[PDB]
Structure formats: C-alpha cells, structure tokens
Amino acid sequence: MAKKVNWYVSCSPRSPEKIQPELKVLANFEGSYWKGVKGYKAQEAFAKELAALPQFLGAFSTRDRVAPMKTYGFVFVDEEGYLRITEAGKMLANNRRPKDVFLKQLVKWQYPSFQHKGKEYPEEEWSINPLVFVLSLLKKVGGLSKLDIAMFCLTATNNNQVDEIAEEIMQFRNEREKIKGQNKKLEFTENYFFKRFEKIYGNVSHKSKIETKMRNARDVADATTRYFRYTGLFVARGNQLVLNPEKSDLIDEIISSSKVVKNYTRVEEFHEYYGNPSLPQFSFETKEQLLDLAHRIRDENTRLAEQLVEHFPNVKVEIQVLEDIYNSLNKKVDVETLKDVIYHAKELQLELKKKKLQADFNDPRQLEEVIDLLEVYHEKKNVIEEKIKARFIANKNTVFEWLTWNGFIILGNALEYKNNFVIDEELQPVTHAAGNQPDMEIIYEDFIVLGEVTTSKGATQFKMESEPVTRHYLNKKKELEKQGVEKELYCLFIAPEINKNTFEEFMKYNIVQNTRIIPLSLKQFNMLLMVQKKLIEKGRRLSSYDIKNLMVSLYRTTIECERKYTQIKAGLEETLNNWVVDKEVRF
Ligand SMILES: [Br-]
Ligand SMILES: [Br-]
Ligand SMILES: [Br-]
Ligand SMILES: [Br-]
Ligand SMILES: [Br-]
Ligand SMILES: [Br-]
Ligand SMILES: [Br-]
Ligand SMILES: [Br-]
Ligand SMILES: [Br-]
Ligand SMILES: [Br-]
Ligand SMILES: [Br-]
Ligand SMILES: [Br-]
Ligand SMILES: [Br-]
C-alpha cells in the first residue's frame, strides 16, 4: 500500500528549541521564489546562512531542515511559488512566548494536513491530532515510556482509537507482568513489538526490515517526548511521559475543542487557520479571565517565596523579578500584555521551584538520593545505562548534567542555578546543553562557577573537553567584562575519571591564559555533598563564603603548586581535605 501507516515528530532537530534559530535565518528569505529550479538560488543561499549557525558548527539537505517548519505551521510555499512566514512562524522567529507558540501549533497539528494529504493520507484511515491523541491516551493509561510510544502511538492514525489502544496497552502490561524473569520480560516485550509492527508494516531480509521500522519508531518516540514536554502539557515522571498535574483544566479544554479541519487541500486556506498562533482561542483567553489567571500565578509564586524566604533568602532574587513583571500591568492591561506577564510569571515560578529544592534537600533521604545516583557513575557503562533508563527519559549524559546541577543546589547559596541543559516543568531533564555552552552557570553574590561535566574517559575525554571547556571559560569571561560584572569566574570540571592530559591542559591554561579551571573527580565532588549532608544533620550548612573559599583555595593551588601533574593533583586533594576538615564534620 502507498498509504502511510504512522505519523512522526521530526528528528531534525529532535529537540524543539533548536528550531528557533533556524527559523530566524529562514525568515530572511520571505518572499523569495522557493519552487523548482528558480527556487535553487534562494534555497542554496539559505543553506549557507544556516550552516554558519552554532548548532551546525560541529551536512543535511535544506528540504530536510525546512520540513518540520512546514509541518508545525511556521512557514509554507504559496501557490505562486514564494516562501511565506506565518504569524506563528513570525512569533517564534522573534522568540515571543515560544513554548506557548509550540503548544498552540502542536494542538492544531493534524493528519491529514496541507503537508500530509491525498493518496498517502486517506481520510478513511487518517483523522488524528497526535498530541491530543496522546493526552487522551494518558488519561487512560497514566504514563508512557518512549518504548510505549514507539510501539503503540505512532501507528495510531485516528483520534477514535484512544480506547482501543488504551485497552491494548493494559493487556500488554498485564501479560508482561506474568512473564517471570526480567530477561524473559525483555524478550516478550521485544517480540510483542516485532509481531505488532509485522501485522502493521505487513506491506512490502524481512526481520532486517521491520527491525528498521522498530528502530525508527524508537528514534521518533524520543523526539516526540521532547517536543511534547516543551509545551508544558506533559512532564516526565521517572522514565514515563505523563500529564502535567498543574494543567488539568487546560488539557480538558484541549481534548474537548480539538478537531481535524477539512480545509487542508489548498495552501492558503489551510495556513490562515494553522499558521495563526491565536488559534485555538481558549475559554480563559479574555482580558477578564487572563487577569484572573495572572493573579492566580502571582499568588502561587508568593506562597512559594514566602515559604522559603526565612531559611533561603536567595529567593529574594525571584521576588524582585516578580515585582518587575507585574508592574507592567500598572501601565497597561490588555490581552497581549497579560499573556506576556503570564508567560514570564510561569518562567519565574520554575525558578522558584528550583530554589524550593533547597528546602527539599533538608530531608537527608532526598539529598542522599542525589548522592547515590551520582555514585552510579562509577559503575561500568552497561550498568549505568540500565539504571538510568529505568529512572529517567533522558540519556545518561544529560542525567549526569542534571545530577551535578542538583549537587550545586544541595550546596546552596546561589543567586541563580542556571542549567544550560533543558528541563521540563517538573524540573526533569530533557536535552543536553548546547555545544557552545557550559553545562551550567551557577551565579553567586560575588563569584560565578561554571559546571562542566562529562562521563567521557581517557583520550576521547581529552578529545571532547579540552577545547570546549577552555573556550566556554574564555567566552564567558569576555562577556562578563563587556557586561561590567565584577565577579571572579571559576570552572569546576567534573568527571568520574579525570584524564591526566585533560588535567594538565587545564593547569597550563590556568597559569598561561589566566583561566580558573578546577578539575574535581566525581568522588571529590560527591565528598562536598556529603559534607553538606552532615552539616545539615547538625543544624548547620555551608555558607556562600564557604563555597567561595573552596573555589579560591583550589584555584590558588592550581597555579602556585610545583609544575608537575602528580604534585598538583596531590595538592588539590590536600587543599580539599583541609576545607573538609575545617567543617568539623564526622569524617
Ligand atoms: Br544555533
Ligand atoms: Br524546502
Ligand atoms: Br517533519
Ligand atoms: Br508548503
Ligand atoms: Br496556552
Ligand atoms: Br526506547
Ligand atoms: Br512487567
Ligand atoms: Br532468561
Ligand atoms: Br521542556
Ligand atoms: Br539562601
Ligand atoms: Br559511562
Ligand atoms: Br542512557
Ligand atoms: Br541530548
């Protein structure tokens, strides 16, 4: 059959925030001829401008990068052959309320559509809003792993199949539980997957063929969870995609008002709807009800801050931003201003939830959980992969970044815990930091620490980290100086095993290029977490000063110590132990 039998979310890119910079470049070619051979000139000029983008300075086809921008309603080619940018594409190019733009586009997203119609996508088989299908399915099955999405969701082609696939997942789960033996369970699962795709791609080395289908499905499932979590309607709970408990009413309305419109065969008529980021218009998107929503979020944020500020006065950072955001309603109260206030207020609530983790970590079980997961990174690669896949959606390299960041939060005192990796609305990890950024920036009152982490080993470690770390350091220092920020910059480089050549390369930059890179073993980093744990046990905790002094002391050792690897290494352990002993904790 030529009929397609699955939908997909693009893997180019697989994480949705990487579209904006592409789209901003593409918007420059609005009004360009973009069809046929006359289309070549503009499309090749675009391709060159895009290859200069940081994310591509590490070779695709232009058509391949543009396709998701068409599928999600940001751009189209009109009937006269010119490239056009929709209002949704314009908003995202300008970075206005991007997660909200994605929510509305992916809620409207349907099959068939202008991009996916005709012979390949017959209405007899196709009538689905993939994101909404998945919201409705989760109401039935609670959660979906990436494998669940690959096995059951992508091959759903009609909104009316929610109940049937719900029933089938539960029957799959009920049987799988009966299979005794973890390995046995893996094989059952894999064979259930093989058979299902068999009846479905029954179309036409067989096994080699449906195994490619299965592999593709897994790939797409990953991308799907990242795009869907980006909207905020979904979050991770362990290794499962689940509904965001704080968006219940919004999710109810989405399910209720979603639809497959039939006006998709001509490009203009379809994009007048699909490219409109005001559509669908939700019940509460009136001035009157947006005031109420803005005020509800303000009260939530206030409640949060006030619970924290007595023991964690660094939340005074978000309290003031909060005041600046809402002072705009003083000047003007219209729907657009309200939307912006509400967008920034949710962003700030997330910032408050990061400081709230400080209070969570007062419970030693919570704190030790972070330590214990970090300790997993001393195990062999196969063990790490298994333990992390069972507890997270994100891969183990991303999770190592997230765990190290939680480590900074446990030590406390920062003004901002700036993860550069992506997290979702429940603070769970999604996508690794970009190649041109350190993994995180922890800003304190009078110093700043970059966190650079890797699970890399030996020469590929040297390979991977020597230039980017020293470059990220130097770019940041440059930026701070241009911005007039009078704070010393440190970089903490953390690996389970720090390679001597990597180490020696950072020592050379420290003394030669005036960097302040401090290489700390995962074991040494975990020691810090244990020192804080014991202090909290005794009613104390580390101060901002304490952390500064560690950074300064270790820094000084890197440049004052004798120029010999073994000496500097032992000097750093010495300095560390002093600091630790100074805390007078049971060690
Ligand atoms: Br980029
Ligand atoms: Br194209
Ligand atoms: Br696509
Ligand atoms: Br098009
Ligand atoms: Br919305
Ligand atoms: Br998977
Ligand atoms: Br099971
Ligand atoms: Br077995
Ligand atoms: Br996200
Ligand atoms: Br604080
Ligand atoms: Br590893
Ligand atoms: Br992994
Ligand atoms: Br990633």
Tab-separated table of N, CA and C and ligand atoms in Angstrom, residues 16-17 99 225-232 234 422-425 428 430, ligand 9:
chain	number	residue	atom	x	y	z
A	16	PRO	N	12.993	20.628	20.327
A	16	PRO	CA	12.230	21.680	19.646
A	16	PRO	C	12.817	23.081	19.764
A	17	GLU	N	13.540	23.355	20.847
A	17	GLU	CA	14.138	24.689	20.982
A	17	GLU	C	15.189	24.956	19.921
A	99	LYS	N	7.161	28.568	24.070
A	99	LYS	CA	6.552	27.310	24.478
A	99	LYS	C	5.044	27.315	24.226
A	225	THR	N	8.691	12.823	22.827
A	225	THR	CA	8.622	13.228	24.241
A	225	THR	C	9.242	14.622	24.444
A	226	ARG	N	10.291	14.947	23.711
A	226	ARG	CA	10.941	16.267	23.918
A	226	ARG	C	10.055	17.401	23.441
A	227	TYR	N	9.412	17.237	22.282
A	227	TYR	CA	8.521	18.276	21.748
A	227	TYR	C	7.300	18.450	22.626
A	228	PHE	N	6.757	17.336	23.134
A	228	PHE	CA	5.539	17.365	23.914
A	228	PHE	C	5.855	17.929	25.303
A	229	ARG	N	6.986	17.542	25.893
A	229	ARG	CA	7.331	18.155	27.182
A	229	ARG	C	7.572	19.659	27.041
A	230	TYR	N	8.083	20.117	25.912
A	230	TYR	CA	8.349	21.538	25.673
A	230	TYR	C	7.083	22.359	25.781
A	231	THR	N	5.918	21.818	25.426
A	231	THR	CA	4.680	22.572	25.550
A	231	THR	C	4.214	22.786	26.986
A	232	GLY	N	4.757	22.010	27.921
A	232	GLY	CA	4.376	22.041	29.322
A	232	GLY	C	3.154	21.211	29.640
A	234	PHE	N	2.889	18.101	29.152
A	234	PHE	CA	3.404	16.808	29.582
A	234	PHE	C	4.673	17.000	30.416
A	422	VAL	N	18.289	21.409	28.930
A	422	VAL	CA	16.850	21.672	29.026
A	422	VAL	C	16.167	20.814	30.075
A	423	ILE	N	15.288	21.404	30.875
A	423	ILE	CA	14.463	20.656	31.828
A	423	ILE	C	12.988	20.930	31.555
A	424	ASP	N	12.084	20.089	32.047
A	424	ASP	CA	10.659	20.300	31.774
A	424	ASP	C	9.974	20.989	32.938
A	425	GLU	N	8.656	21.120	32.943
A	425	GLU	CA	8.003	21.874	34.006
A	425	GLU	C	8.075	21.197	35.364
A	428	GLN	N	12.518	17.949	35.444
A	428	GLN	CA	13.206	16.737	34.988
A	428	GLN	C	13.969	16.996	33.698
A	430	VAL	N	15.687	16.978	29.990
A	430	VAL	CA	15.232	16.660	28.647
A	430	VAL	C	16.381	16.543	27.651
B	9	BR	BR	10.983	21.232	28.138
